[PDB]
Amino acid sequence: TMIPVLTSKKASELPVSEVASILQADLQNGLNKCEVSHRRAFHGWNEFDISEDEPLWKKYISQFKNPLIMLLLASAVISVLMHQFDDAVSITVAILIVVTVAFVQEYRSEKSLEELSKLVPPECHCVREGKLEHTLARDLVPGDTVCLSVGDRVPADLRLFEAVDLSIDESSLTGETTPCSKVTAPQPAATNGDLASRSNIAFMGTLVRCGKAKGVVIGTGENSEFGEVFKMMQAEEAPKTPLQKSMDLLGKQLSFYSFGIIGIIMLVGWLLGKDILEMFTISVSLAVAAIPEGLPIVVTVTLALGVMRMVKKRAIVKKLPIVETLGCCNVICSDKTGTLTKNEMTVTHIFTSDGLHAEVTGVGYNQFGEVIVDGDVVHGFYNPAVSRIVEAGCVCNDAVIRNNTLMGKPTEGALIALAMKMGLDGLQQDYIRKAEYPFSSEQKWMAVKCVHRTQQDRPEICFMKGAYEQVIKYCTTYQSKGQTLTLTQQQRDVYQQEKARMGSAGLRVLALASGPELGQLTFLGLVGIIDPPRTGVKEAVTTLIASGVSIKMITGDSQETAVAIASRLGLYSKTSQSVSGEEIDAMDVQQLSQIVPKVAVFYRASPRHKMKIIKSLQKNGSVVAMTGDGVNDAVALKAADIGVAMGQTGTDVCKEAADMILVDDDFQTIMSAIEEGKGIYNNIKNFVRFQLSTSIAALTLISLATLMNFPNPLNAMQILWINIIMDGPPAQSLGVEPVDKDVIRKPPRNWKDSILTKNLILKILVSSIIIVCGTLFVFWRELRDNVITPRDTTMTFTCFVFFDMFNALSSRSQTKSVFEIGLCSNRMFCYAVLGSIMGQLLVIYFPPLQKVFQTESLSILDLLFLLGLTSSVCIVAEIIKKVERSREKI
**115 labelled binding-site residue:** no
Q: Is 404 part of any known ligand binding site?
A: no
**If we measure between CA atoms, which residue out of 170, 160, 155 comes closest to residue 123?**
155
CB contact set of 141 (below 8 Å; sequence gap of 6+): 31, 35, 36, 39, 40, 43, 46, 217, 220
Backbone torsion region of residue 283, taken as left when φ is above 0, otherwise alpha when ψ lies between -120 and 50, otherwise beta: alpha
Q: Is 526 left (phi over 0), alpha (psi -120 to 50) or beta?
A: beta
335 in catalytic set: yes
- Of 398 and 629, nearer to ligand BEF (C-beta) is 629
# residues near Ca ion by CB under 5 A: 4
Distance of closest approach, residue 807 Cβ to ligand BEF, in angstroms: 52
| Least gap, CB of 63 to Ca ion (angstroms) | 16
Return the amino acid letter for 742. D
Nearer to ligand BEF, 337 or 397 (CB): 337
Q: For residue 662, count other CB atoms closer than 10 A to its CB.
A: 23
401 within 8 A of 365, measured Cβ to Cβ: yes
* 338 forms part of the interface with Mg ion (CB under 5 A): yes
- Residue 336 interacts, among Mg ion, ligand BEF, Ca ion, none and using kind-specific CB cut-offs from 5 to 8 Å, with ligand BEF
Query: Nearest to residue 264, comparing CAs of 718, 702, 800?
Result: 702
Using CB under 6 A as the criterion, which residues of the chain lie in contact with ligand BEF when the complex forms?
175, 335-338, 555-557, 629-630, 632-633
Candidate segments 136-144, 333-341, 753-761, 792-800, binder of Mg ion by CB under 5 A: 333-341
Binding window for Mg ion (CB under 5 A); candidates: 561-569, 626-634, 838-846, 881-889: 626-634
Near Mg ion by CB under 5 A: residue from 391, 398, 629, 675: 629
Q: What is the 3-state secondary structure (H, E, C) of 80-105?
A: HCCCCCHHHHHHHHHHHHHHHHHHHH
Does the footprint of Mg ion cover residue 768 (CB under 5 A)? no
DSSP letter at 184 equals S
Nearest approach, Cβ of residue 332 and Ca ion (Å): 39
Cβ–Cβ under 8 Å, residues 757 and 830: no
Q: Looking at 331-339, 350-358, 472-480, 721-729, which segment touches Mg ion (CB under 5 A)?
A: 331-339
Q: Does 242 bind Mg ion (CB under 5 A)?
A: no
d(CA 706, CA 702): 6
Beta carbon nearer to Mg ion, 335 or 737: 335
Q: Which of 335, 557, 641, 659 is catalytic?
A: 335
Length of the chain, in residues: 890
Q: Which does 206 bind (CB under 5 to 8 A by kind): Mg ion, ligand BEF, Ca ion, none?
A: none
In eight-state DSSP terms, residue 257 is: H
Asked whether the beta carbons of 183 and 163 are under 8 A apart, the reply is: yes
Q: Which is nearer to Mg ion, 142 or 630 (CB)?
A: 630
- Would you say 86 is a known binding-site residue? no
Shortest reach from residue 641's CB to Ca ion, in Å: 32
Q: Write the DSSP string, 650-694.
A: --HHHHHH-SEEESS--STHHHHHHHHHHHHHHHHHHHHHHHHHH
Binding partner of residue 391 among Ca ion, Mg ion, ligand BEF, none, CB cut-off 5 to 8 Å per kind:
none
Residue 306 interacts with Mg ion (CB under 5 A): yes or no: no
| H/E element, 360 | strand 357-361
Q: Which helix (H) or strand (E) holds 478?
A: strand 475-480
Tell me which residues in 292-321 interact with Ca ion (CB under 5 A): 293
* Contact present, 614 and 623 (Cβ < 8 Å): no
Kindly tell me which residue out of 166, 289, 527, 702 binds Ca ion, with binding defined by CB under 5 A. Answer: 289
291 marked among binding-site residues:
yes
Does 163 participate in binding Ca ion (rule CB under 5 A)?
A: no
Closer Cβ to ligand BEF, 127 or 645, answer by number: 645
Q: Which is nearer to Mg ion, 633 or 675 (CB)?
A: 633
Asked if 337 is part of the footprint of Mg ion (rule: CB under 5 A), the reply reads: yes
Query: 10 Å Cβ neighbour count for 861?
Result: 8
Q: Which residue lies nearest Mg ion, judged by its C-beta?
A: 338
Please tell me whether residue 804 binds Ca ion under the rule CB under 5 A.
Answer: no
Q: Is 723 annotated as a binding residue?
A: yes
What residues numbered 708-747 form the site for Ca ion, per CB under 5 A? Answer: 723, 727
Concatenating the DSSP letter of every residue in 537-596 gives THHHHHHHHHTT-EE-EE--S-HHHHHHHHHHHT---TT-----HHHHHHS-HHHHTTTS
Contact partner at residue 289 from Mg ion, Ca ion, ligand BEF, none, CB < 5 to 8 Å by partner kind: Ca ion
Q: Which is nearer to Ca ion, 281 or 723 (CB)?
A: 723
Report the 10 Å Cβ neighbour count for 245.
12
C-alpha 792/C-alpha 855 separation (Å) is 9
Task: Pick between residue 610 and residue 812 the one whose CB is nearest to ligand BEF.
Answer: 610
Stretch that binds Mg ion, among 196-204, 393-401, 425-433, 621-629 (CB under 5 A): 621-629
Least distance (Å) between residue 65 CB and Ca ion:
18
Helix/strand/coil for 793:
helix
CB-based contact 323:310 (threshold 8 Å): yes
Q: Which is nearer to ligand BEF, 394 or 637 (CB)?
A: 637
CB of 407: closest distance to Mg ion in angstroms? 21
Determine whether the annotation assigns residue 727 to a binding site: yes
Establish whether 87 is an annotated binding residue: no
Residues catalogued as catalytic? 335
Q: From the annotation, which residues make up the binding site?
A: 288-289, 291, 293, 629, 633, 723, 727
Positions touching Ca ion (CB under 5 A) are: 289, 293, 723, 727
Chain residues that interact with Mg ion, rule: CB under 5 A: 335, 337-338, 629-630
Annotated binding site for Mg(2+): which residue ranges? Answer: 629, 633
Task: List binding-site positions for Ca(2+).
Answer: 288-289, 291, 293, 723, 727
